Amino acid sequence: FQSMKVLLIYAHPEPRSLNGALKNFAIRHLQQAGHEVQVSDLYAMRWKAGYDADDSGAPPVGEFWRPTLDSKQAFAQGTQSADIVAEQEKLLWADTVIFQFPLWWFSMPAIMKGWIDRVYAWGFAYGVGEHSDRHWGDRYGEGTFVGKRAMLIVTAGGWAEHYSPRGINGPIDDILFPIQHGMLFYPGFEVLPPLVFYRTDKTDAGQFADQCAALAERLDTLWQTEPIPFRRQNHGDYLIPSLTLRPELAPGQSGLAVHLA
């Protein structure tokens, strides 16, 4: 068989919302298939969003507290706040991590961004590895999360056409790049194509049934779907330390698309 360990990070303030419905569907679907599921329901946990000096469990390491170096010490010395530590343990436990949220101002809800900011410590999600001739940190297809898969599940009010290649909001995959490339591929996840639902504010029973069918199909194929083929940083595709794509790859092109093989 092979029972997978799935962690769902979920950001919506109302349990009877569309998002709440889809969350409950996904959790039941995965449990019925034989997988184990842990959930971080950020609003239910009253998750603290603003990273600050109370998270480091120690006085400042230098003359004044620094978001970076104070994390580096807290993580290395074992003083981080206990909420942080429990999330980090969930991530280490999981084989697959799913982030589920409504699109709010073209980005994660604040409370979810605060999960990123606080959980992704120095020594854990960044700051790991050497800086040398041909290696510039353990990131972008390397890091703590190598071997794990991640996927977003996003609901949006705008129409699909509004997120099309010439659509005014920007192409969906480019708007999601800071998340999928910067937050998921960065600490070493294999990132699956996102599941994005459009025109969600008017969802009725028939649209919901369509959403559920699409969701179940993604959840059934989590370990078969091909990841987004983002380029690794440290294995020849980029010049180091400029971290620019070598001239023979995607020649004469620039922008977000050059980072896909």
Identity of the residue, 73 or 155, whose beta carbon is nearer to ligand FAD in the bound complex = 155
Q: Kindly write out the interface string for residues 107-126 of this chain, putting x where it contacts a second copy by CB under 8 A and - elsewhere.
A: xxxxx-xx-xx--x------
The reply on whether position 158 binds ligand FAD by CB under 6 A is: yes
- The CB-of-227 to a second copy minimum distance in angstroms stands at 17
Cβ atoms of 42 and 115 within 8 Å: the answer is yes
Q: What are phi and psi of 33, to 5 degrees?
A: -80, -5
Cβ atoms of 117 and 67 within 8 Å: the answer is no
Q: What are phi and psi of 99, to 5 degrees?
A: -110, 120
Q: How far apart are CA 42 and CA 40, in angstroms?
A: 6
Strand blocks (E) in 19-136: 36-41, 96-102, 131-132, 135-136
Site for a second copy (CB under 8 A): which residue of 130, 161, 217, 220? 161
Q: Kindly write out the interface string for residues 21-40 of this chain, putting x where it contacts a second copy by CB under 8 A and - elsewhere.
A: --------------------
Going by their DSSP bridges, the two strands 149-155 and 96-102 should be labelled as parallel
- The CB-of-118 to Cl ion minimum distance in angstroms stands at 17
Q: Which stretch binds Cl ion (CB under 5 A): 45-53, 136-144, 190-198, 228-236?
A: 136-144
Half-sphere exposure of 225 (CA within 13 A, CB side): 18
Size of the site for Cl ion (CB under 5 A): 6
The 3-state DSSP class for residue 123 equals coil
- The CB-of-218 to a second copy minimum distance in angstroms stands at 24
Tracing tokens 């990273």 back to the chain, one arrives at 51
Beta bridge partners of 10: 41, 100
The verdict on whether residue 225 carries a ligand-binding annotation is: no
Q: Which stretch binds ligand FAD (CB under 6 A): 66-74, 76-84, 138-146, 222-230?
A: 66-74
- Give the footprint of ligand FAD on residues 25-64 (CB under 6 A): none
Residues in contact with ligand FAD by CB under 6 A are 12, 17-19, 21, 66-68, 102-106, 117, 155-158, 200-201, 203-205, 208
